[PDB]
Structure 1
Amino acid sequence: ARQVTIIGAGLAGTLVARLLARNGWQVNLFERRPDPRIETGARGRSINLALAERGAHALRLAGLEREVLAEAVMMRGRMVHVPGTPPNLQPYGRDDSEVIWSINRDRLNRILLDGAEAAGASIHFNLGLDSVDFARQRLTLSNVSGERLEKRFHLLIGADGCNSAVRQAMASVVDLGEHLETQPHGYKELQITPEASAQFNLEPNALHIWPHGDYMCIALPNLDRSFTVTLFLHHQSPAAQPASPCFAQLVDGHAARRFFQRQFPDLSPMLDSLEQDFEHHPTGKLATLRLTTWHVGGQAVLLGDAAHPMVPFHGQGMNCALEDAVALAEHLQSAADNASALAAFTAQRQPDALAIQAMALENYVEMSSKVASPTYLLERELGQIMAQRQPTRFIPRYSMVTFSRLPYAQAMARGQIQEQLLKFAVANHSDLTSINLDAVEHEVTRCLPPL
């Protein structure tokens, strides 16, 4: 009676499992990793994520928001660390009282798994999808230890991440028209201990950034006052500058230390285990991957990172994946057949995914310049003034993405109109006093309707 098989008990897969099982679907969820709810003496290396209104609202629909927020650290603003000034807290939003939540990935995953099982989903861990035969609707799963399993499916949901095996298998039965846009930046995950964070008075209730042009660090807080730090830096040196910093040069921990002490002097002292973490934590790859479609008939569909890998510079990948899960469950529950459901899900979500993929790419330059043209600065100055005058019409794209549930595609479209307005108003002006705010405001209401 309405059967579904989900590959990937990650963020999207576990949430859609709950929503469907809730609705009376027979749900089986297969996961390559062990069950994180089985307590061990290990301590999780806390990947932590920014949870925004979008993501929170998706959890709210599933009745899990309260539980997740109880284990999330409130970030009331962005702490920018740049040389020559003390830490600069930029309160989020307008009233200076919007927030973003920092949630440990594993804690969130545990809560979602309990939610799925509570709803009736059956979860099987330590089983990795190897292949799919779409003519027989058969799956082949394996473990590096315990071995081989063949299973039929009725409907298959690929929630199996940026390297989706389901996506790989689908490419045969439909042209996905995939295009990968590789990212010159890699990333490295590092840690600040509770001890060091207190010693240097690092603010727990904020998102911290250390901008440095073509490379940067960010840090998100944990409940225990530790911070998870991410370094974004080129894999290799580029043609135009063959000796600029990159991972290729940082051949060991001592090299990494030299790099931090020079380029991030206030951060380095806080990274006690920099050498170890650097050598034992693998260097991550970033990329944007776009598909023309996310489903094969009514047989299988992709969502979350499986459907739309994006660069992490907007902190929205998880948020988008949770939104996807809600949308997929809604379509599966209102459709003439599964094929129509999957096509309608794709038509709804694919434009939104394209929009956040593009917006995330652009968000990099915003975070990490702190070298900005006076034109860019004047544009920002003007945009804040416009938001003040017309709070209902002019909403900074970042706020639309982060603090509202307006569809990504709409946020991009309005952001584009706002961008045009500002640039034409600011062009060939040295400063703000030459700008006629009245003329500019007139254009905001002309070109920008209320939501």
Structure 2
Amino acid sequence: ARQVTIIGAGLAGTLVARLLARNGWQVNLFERRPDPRIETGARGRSINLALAERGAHALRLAGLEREVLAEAVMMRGRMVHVPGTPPNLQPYGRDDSEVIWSINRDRLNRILLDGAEAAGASIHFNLGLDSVDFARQRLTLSNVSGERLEKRFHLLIGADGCNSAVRQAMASVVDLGEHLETQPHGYKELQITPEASAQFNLEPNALHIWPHGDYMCIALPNLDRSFTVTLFLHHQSPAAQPASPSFAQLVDGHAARRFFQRQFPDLSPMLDSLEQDFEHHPTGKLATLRLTTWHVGGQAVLLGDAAHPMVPFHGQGMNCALEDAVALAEHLQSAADNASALAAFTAQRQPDALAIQAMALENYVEMSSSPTYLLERELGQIMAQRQPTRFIPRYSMVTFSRLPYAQAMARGQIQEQLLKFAVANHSDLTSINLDAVEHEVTRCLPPL
């Protein structure tokens, strides 16, 4: 039986562990944190993620989709909140088959851990990877107390997240050709209780957005009608705009309250614990990290956040990581040898990871910001109605299909250009020759 050591029992790590273990691989998974399935008296906080077709399909292949979806809230559309207009629901798709699912990350991770163990993988918690000796094929792990443990390895999978220790160890034997693009927005998680969301009639079956240009809030629902609100705001005010809001200007929870009362007045009354959440929850950091190299011969490979940290503005990081896990298990299972598997996996996934990284950055302006754009959306709807197998909005291709991200991006760009061109020099849709735009659609977009 082929052997594999996986670092990180997160989303990608535990999925790849199940896929490989059920194919008869001897799987050992090392995780720095304690086992979250071991109930303690610690007061844990709920963070939700948007699960879309890519992630759901990866879970479906693993035989875990039903179990995960039983614990997920359906999000039928986007609810945009702008003061002075009632909340506007933008349905995500044609019907309830085109939805996104809000899932608690901890619940998802527990289901995944059970799945990897049921398949035969062994999971070792409270052991963080410290270093790797590639030449000797040994690695060093330690608990929180710094007590060390050395292990021999045959194949090493770095599923250890955005601050990957495997990636850091690889960067000592190979030049990974890493390019870090820092992101100016920090984030803070705030809570809306079930009583508050019910009192203010906040729709449970939708993804909620409070756009505000350079900053914004998003809320995802929980099974119990509570919501996790995420504020995206610059860490610091720029040199050009010193008065512009930033985390540096919000000295404490009381400053955060005044800021919400002024900038998010319809949201502030729903945030009962705003002050407390602001001071006790740390401000998170965002970034995009692109690597030229994801593997060291047949010895080690990266996937998920370890390979391609991305900004969260498209809610695709977990979706992409689960898609990566399927691809990596498929390549490893069927390749001539591990070195061939790792090279084929990297060649396949690298263009798609770059595409979602670019699309995630672009989605921010789409969410947080129109005149000509409403005419573009109107024309886009008609083109999707006339040619549903050719004109598929980029958001739908990314969220509701398994089309390679690079293909969704390339087709999205053709669509964006046709719409921009068609509406230019036109006041309304009546002056636009719909058949001529349709002719460009049939000419430039092959049916799917």
TMscore range, shorter length: over 0.9
Deviates more, 1:84-93 or 1:223-232: 84-93
**CA deviation after TM superposition for structure 1 residue 435, in Å:** 1.7
Partner secondary structure for residue 169 of structure 2: helix
Q: d(CA) in 1 for partners of 2:242 and 2:99?
A: 41
Q: d(CA) in 1 for partners of 2:212 and 2:97?
A: 28
Partner secondary structure for residue 257 of structure 1: helix
**CA deviation after TM superposition for structure 1 residue 199, in Å:** 1.1
**CA deviation after TM superposition for structure 1 residue 293, in Å:** 1.6
2:142 equivalent in structure 1 = 142
**CA deviation after TM superposition for structure 1 residue 94, in Å:** 2.6
* Contact 1:212–1:368, Cα closer than 8 Å, also in 2: yes
* Contact 2:211–2:367, Cα closer than 8 Å, also in 1: yes
2:34 equivalent in structure 1 = 34
Partner secondary structure for residue 73 of structure 2: strand
Q: d(CA) in 2 for partners of 1:427 and 1:139?
A: 60
**CA deviation after TM superposition for structure 1 residue 224, in Å:** 1.1
Deviates more, 1:427-436 or 1:332-341: 427-436
Q: d(CA) in 2 for partners of 1:272 and 1:42?
A: 22
| Aligned residues between the structures | 448
**CA deviation after TM superposition for structure 1 residue 84, in Å:** 1.6
**CA deviation after TM superposition for structure 1 residue 431, in Å:** 2.4
* Contact 2:137–2:152, Cα closer than 8 Å, also in 1: yes
Partner secondary structure for residue 250 of structure 2: coil
Q: d(CA) in 2 for partners of 1:36 and 1:97?
A: 32
**CA deviation after TM superposition for structure 1 residue 145, in Å:** 2.3
Q: d(CA) in 2 for partners of 1:313 and 1:76?
A: 18
Q: d(CA) in 2 for partners of 1:336 and 1:350?
A: 21
Deviates more, 1:162-171 or 1:197-206: 197-206
Partner secondary structure for residue 27 of structure 1: strand
1:154 equivalent in structure 2 = 154
* Contact 1:127–1:143, Cα closer than 8 Å, also in 2: yes
* Contact 1:128–1:141, Cα closer than 8 Å, also in 2: yes
* CA spacing shift, 1:82–1:169, aligned 2, 3 Å: same
* Contact 2:183–2:286, Cα closer than 8 Å, also in 1: yes
* Contact 2:5–2:27, Cα closer than 8 Å, also in 1: yes
**CA deviation after TM superposition for structure 1 residue 41, in Å:** 3.0
* CA spacing shift, 1:187–1:263, aligned 2, 3 Å: same
Is 1:219 matched with 2:219?
yes
1:184 equivalent in structure 2 = 184
Q: d(CA) in 1 for partners of 2:29 and 2:246?
A: 40
- Unpaired runs of 5+ in structure 2? none
Q: d(CA) in 1 for partners of 2:310 and 2:175?
A: 20
Is 1:101 matched with 2:98?
no
**CA deviation after TM superposition for structure 1 residue 62, in Å:** 0.3
Cα displacement string for residues 347-401 of structure 1 (whole angstroms, at most 9, x for unaligned residues): 11111101100000000000110xxx42223222221121111111000000000
Cα displacement string for residues 297-331 of structure 1 (whole angstroms, at most 9, x for unaligned residues): 00000000000000000000000000000000000
Q: d(CA) in 1 for partners of 2:343 and 2:97?
A: 39
**CA deviation after TM superposition for structure 1 residue 418, in Å:** 0.7
Partner secondary structure for residue 231 of structure 1: strand
**CA deviation after TM superposition for structure 1 residue 203, in Å:** 1.1
Q: d(CA) in 1 for partners of 2:334 and 2:144?
A: 40
Cα displacement string for residues 133-168 of structure 1 (whole angstroms, at most 9, x for unaligned residues): 111111111122261111110000000000000001
* Contact 2:83–2:265, Cα closer than 8 Å, also in 1: no
* Contact 1:7–1:159, Cα closer than 8 Å, also in 2: yes
1:279 equivalent in structure 2 = 279
Q: d(CA) in 1 for partners of 2:277 and 2:424?
A: 46
Runs of 4+ in 1 over 3 A off after TM superposition: none
Cα displacement string for residues 218-261 of structure 1 (whole angstroms, at most 9, x for unaligned residues): 00011111101100011111133111100010010011001000
Partner secondary structure for residue 248 of structure 1: helix
* Contact 1:215–1:231, Cα closer than 8 Å, also in 2: yes
- Unpaired runs of 5+ in structure 1? none
Q: d(CA) in 2 for partners of 1:223 and 1:424?
A: 44
Partner secondary structure for residue 247 of structure 2: coil
Alignment of 1:206-245 (within 5 A): 206-245=206-245
Partner secondary structure for residue 284 of structure 1: coil
What percent identity do the matched residue pairs reach? Answer: 100
Q: d(CA) in 2 for partners of 1:66 and 1:303?
A: 25
**CA deviation after TM superposition for structure 1 residue 97, in Å:** 5.0
* Contact 1:351–1:409, Cα closer than 8 Å, also in 2: yes
2:249 equivalent in structure 1 = 249
* Cα RMSD (Å): 1.1
Alignment of 1:37-436 (within 5 A): 37-95=37-95, 98-145=98-145, 147-369=147-369, 373-436=370-433
**CA deviation after TM superposition for structure 1 residue 430, in Å:** 2.5
* Contact 1:78–1:207, Cα closer than 8 Å, also in 2: yes
**CA deviation after TM superposition for structure 1 residue 95, in Å:** 4.0
**CA deviation after TM superposition for structure 1 residue 42, in Å:** 3.2
Partner secondary structure for residue 351 of structure 1: helix
**CA deviation after TM superposition for structure 1 residue 43, in Å:** 4.0
* Contact 1:91–1:97, Cα closer than 8 Å, also in 2: no
Partner secondary structure for residue 285 of structure 2: strand
Cα displacement string for residues 3-43 of structure 1 (whole angstroms, at most 9, x for unaligned residues): 10000000000000000000111100000111010112334
Q: d(CA) in 2 for partners of 1:174 and 1:304?
A: 19
**CA deviation after TM superposition for structure 1 residue 432, in Å:** 2.1
* Contact 1:58–1:322, Cα closer than 8 Å, also in 2: yes
Deviates more, 1:168-177 or 1:294-303: 168-177
Deviates more, 1:423-432 or 1:405-414: 423-432
**CA deviation after TM superposition for structure 1 residue 428, in Å:** 2.4
Cα displacement string for residues 161-190 of structure 1 (whole angstroms, at most 9, x for unaligned residues): 000000011012111110011111111111
